[PDB]
Amino acid sequence: MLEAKFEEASLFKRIIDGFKDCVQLVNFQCKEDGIIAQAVDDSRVLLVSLEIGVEAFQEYRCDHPVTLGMDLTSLSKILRCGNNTDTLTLIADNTPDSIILLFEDTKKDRIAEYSLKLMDIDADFLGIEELQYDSTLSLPSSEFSKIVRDLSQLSDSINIMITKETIKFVADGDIGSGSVIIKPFVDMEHPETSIKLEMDQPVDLTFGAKYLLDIIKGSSLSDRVGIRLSSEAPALFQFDLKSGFLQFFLAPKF
Amino acid sequence: THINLKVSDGSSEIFFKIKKTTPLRRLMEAFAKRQGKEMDSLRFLYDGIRIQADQTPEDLDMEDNDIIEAHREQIGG
Numbered sequence: 001m002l003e004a005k006f007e008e009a010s011l012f013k014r015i016i017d018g019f020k021d022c023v024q025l026v027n028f029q030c031k032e033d034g035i036i037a038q039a040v041d042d043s044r045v046l047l048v049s050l051e052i053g054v055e056a057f058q059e060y061r062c063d064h065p066v067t068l069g070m071d072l073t074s075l076s077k078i079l080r081c082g083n084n085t086d087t088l089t090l091i092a093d094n095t096p097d098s099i100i101l102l103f104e105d106t107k108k109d110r111i112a113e114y115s116l117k118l119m120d121i122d123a124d125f126l127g128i129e130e131l132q133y134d135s136t137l138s139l140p141s142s143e144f145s146k147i148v149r150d151l152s153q154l155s156d157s158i159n160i161m162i163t164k165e166t167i168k169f170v171a172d173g174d175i176g177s178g179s180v181i182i183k184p185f186v187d188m189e190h191p192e193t194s195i196k197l198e199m200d201q202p203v204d205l206t207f208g209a210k211y212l213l214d215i216i217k218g219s220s221l222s223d224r225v226g227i228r229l230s231s232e233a234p235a236l237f238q239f240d241l242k243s244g245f246l247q248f249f250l251a252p253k254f
Numbered sequence: 255t256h257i258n259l260k261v262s263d264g265s266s267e268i269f270f271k272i273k274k275t276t277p278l279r280r281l282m283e284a285f286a287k288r289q290g291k292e293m294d295s296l297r298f299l300y301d302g303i304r305i306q307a308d309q310t311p312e313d314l315d316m317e318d319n320d321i322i323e324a325h326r327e328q329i330g331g
């Protein structure tokens with residue numbers, strides 16, 4: 001028995017809308033203490049992992065772990081029918097092959113119920129917390145957005161380079177070339193504008209701008225961004241959310 | 255309330271008498287001046303860990319007679 005009940009269907013719509021940018025399929029790992037929205041893009045390059053914690057809901061029951069694979073197009077179709085100030089509850093039993101979406105309107109008025117068929121998402125999700133990375137930095141989301149949006153205009157590739165006390169994004173191209181150098185920087189009057197860097201190894205990794213463009217959309221949900229890089233694993237982009245947590249995993253370019 | 259610290263590198267030991275609530279900046283400045291050196295060029299270590307200038311003896315639980323190692327700061331990295 002799973003009963004995930006959001007106060008407003010707009011909160012769930014916002015999540016479904018977000019994923020709809022990167023991915024087309026999503027796999028909802030529902031557990032006792034929340035839901036983990038796992039997703040792989042169509043090129044299998046970018047991996048999305050979203051932690052929706054118990055506190056995100058108005059009521060949450062999960063007596064047993066269930067996995068709910070859903071088509072994001074179909075799911076959007078149902079989402080249109082209910083009102084934004086409607087209470088949305090996802091209902092599934094143990095071992096589900098179908099799911100129920102219950103929209104409810106207040107006072108004890110109106111209940112709208114729609115069914116959706118789950119799909120089987122077989123491939124195992126490779127969310128890598130990776131026990132150790134070469135470099136870990138954190139910076140304002142807006143700043144990281146600005147950099148990525150500028151340099152993507154110069155190329156489809158953005159290289160990230162970490163040295164002792166230096167982070168450098170670079171994009172060379174055919175019209176021109178550009179690069180931002182940013183440094184560790186702390187301010188007490190405005191702590192939310194700090195840049196943190198930790199290094200154990202220099203890193204030099206090239207990334208597809210279109211992917212980084214997808215990632216930066218996480219800033220609309222958070223004001224800092226954690227970036228953990230390493231020459232063996234995909235890069236980890238993390239955002240802290242009220243819901244819980246947002247993680248992108250990106251394969252470097254050859 | 256006033257612990258007594260001994261600061262030293264390889265060749266020079268000094269005693270400073272600071273209050274448990276005074277930040278350690280005052281003392282690192284004072285040791286670096288008495289060597290005609292700048293505070294950024296020296297790396298102060300207490301019982302392994304590198305002291306931060308803003309930290310106080312209280313924070314680090316410095317008892318009487320504790321030793322602060324001073325080492326040179328390498329430029330890289």
Ligand SMILES: *C1=CC(=O)N(CC)C1=O
Pocket residue numbers: 015018019020021022023039048050214215217218
């Ligand atoms: C792609 C952009 C984004 O914000 N998310 C999660 C909500 C994606 O999957």
Ligand SMILES: *C1=CC(=O)N(CC)C1=O
Pocket residue numbers: 077078079080081114
């Ligand atoms: C939800 C509203 C609606 O009209 N439909 C049919 C496509 C739904 O699934």
Ligand SMILES: [Ba+2]
Pocket residue numbers: 021022214
């Ligand atoms: Ba897209």
Ligand SMILES: [Ba+2]
Pocket residue numbers: 055056057058
């Ligand atoms: Ba709440």
Ligand SMILES: [Ba+2]
Pocket residue numbers: 055057058059
């Ligand atoms: Ba609640």
Ligand SMILES: [Ba+2]
Pocket residue numbers: 080081082083084
């Ligand atoms: Ba509507």
Ligand SMILES: [Ba+2]
Pocket residue numbers: 007008085086087106
């Ligand atoms: Ba409501």
Ligand SMILES: [Ba+2]
Pocket residue numbers: 093094095096097
């Ligand atoms: Ba069943």
Ligand SMILES: [Ba+2]
Pocket residue numbers: 155172173
């Ligand atoms: Ba190039």
Ligand SMILES: [Ba+2]
Pocket residue numbers: 240241242244
């Ligand atoms: Ba939080």
Ligand SMILES: [Ba+2]
Pocket residue numbers: none
């Ligand atoms: Ba320095």
Ligand SMILES: [Ba+2]
Pocket residue numbers: 315316317
């Ligand atoms: Ba002690």
Ligand SMILES: [Ba+2]
Pocket residue numbers: 315
């Ligand atoms: Ba003690």
Ligand SMILES: [Ba+2]
Pocket residue numbers: 317320
């Ligand atoms: Ba001691």
Ligand SMILES: [Ba+2]
Pocket residue numbers: 327328329330331
């Ligand atoms: Ba230095």
